[PDB]
Structure 1
Amino acid sequence: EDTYYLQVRGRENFEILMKLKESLELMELVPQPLVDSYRQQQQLLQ
């Protein structure tokens, strides 16, 4: 549906991108209220 393929040179590069792919794909599963608490937290630290 909205799946995207890419290609990367370098094992270290692939590993970083797999770490972030994971964390970015999982973000959709984080309840919005906890996201809102979190962004509140970041703004307070400014």
Structure 2
Amino acid sequence: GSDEDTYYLQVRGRKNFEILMKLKESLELMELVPQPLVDSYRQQQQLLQR
């Protein structure tokens, strides 16, 4: 689900590729999986803020 277009990246970075892959996949999954644990931890941890 989305358009018919895709963005392409051609770059050589050992650290950069490892990092960008995990952060890229992270947000893709964050968009596909719901946010229960996100709000659950957000609030449970908000009790540490004042």
Give 1 or 2: higher helix fraction. Answer: 1
Which runs of 5 or more residues in structure 1 are unaligned? none
Give 1 or 2: higher strand fraction. Answer: 2
1:45 matched residue in structure 2: 48
Identity of aligned residues (%): 98
Give the ranges of 4+ consecutive aligned residues of structure 1 lying more than 3 Å apart after TM superposition. Answer: 1-9
TM-score normalized by the length of structure 2: 0.55
- 1:1-46 Cα deviation digits (max 9, x unpaired): 5744445442111111101111111001232333321221332232
Which runs of 5 or more residues in structure 2 are unaligned? none
TM-score normalized by the length of structure 1: 0.58
